[PDB]
Amino acid sequence: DILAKNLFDRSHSNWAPVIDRLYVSEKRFMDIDSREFSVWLNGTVKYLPFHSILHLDEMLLEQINGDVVKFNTHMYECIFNNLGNLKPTNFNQDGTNDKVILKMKELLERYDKALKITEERINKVPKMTQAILN
């Protein structure tokens, strides 16, 4: 029923019902191939609301069992694109307590972690792309 109400209208594809379904569902994203799934998710899922982007973030975490190192480029790109496409809820006068900015630095620090845990394990690697900076 979820595919019918929103996805049928080509102009505006609303993926909040879909993400909410797959977050409510116990199966979530586990047991799904990282590669095909990352490319599809990045390609199609855009303009998500903030809470949807959260649920998607933790549920990719649960897909990958919480291994920061495995977390691929396209995964970053999807989360970052959705975060950026969000407009500010309100222009706070100081304008530094935004949620999106904090989650954005959270993801960057997570990347730094993943790199450090990979190097420590030594004792493909993820990359940053112009899309994330943009």
Partner RNA sequence: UUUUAUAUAUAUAUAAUAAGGAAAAGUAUUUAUAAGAA
**Can you give the binding site for RNA, defined by CB under 7 A?**
35, 38-39, 42-43, 46, 72-74, 81, 84-85, 124, 127, 129-131, 134
Nearer to RNA, 35 or 116 (CB): 35
Closest CA to 46 of 82, 2, 5, 98: 82
Cβ of residue 96: shortest distance to RNA, in angstroms?
20
Nearer to RNA, 23 or 107 (CB): 107
Give the H/E segment covering residue 118: helix 99-122
Nearer to RNA, 55 or 71 (CB): 71
First to last CA, the chain: 36
Cβ of residue 26: shortest distance to RNA, in angstroms?
28
Give the torsion sign (CA, 131, 18, 111, 68): negative
Torsion angle, alpha carbons of 118, 119, 122, 125, to 10 = 50
Cβ of residue 47: shortest distance to RNA, in angstroms?
9
Nearer to RNA, 38 or 52 (CB): 38
Cβ of residue 25: shortest distance to RNA, in angstroms?
25
Closest CA to 85 of 15, 29, 37: 15
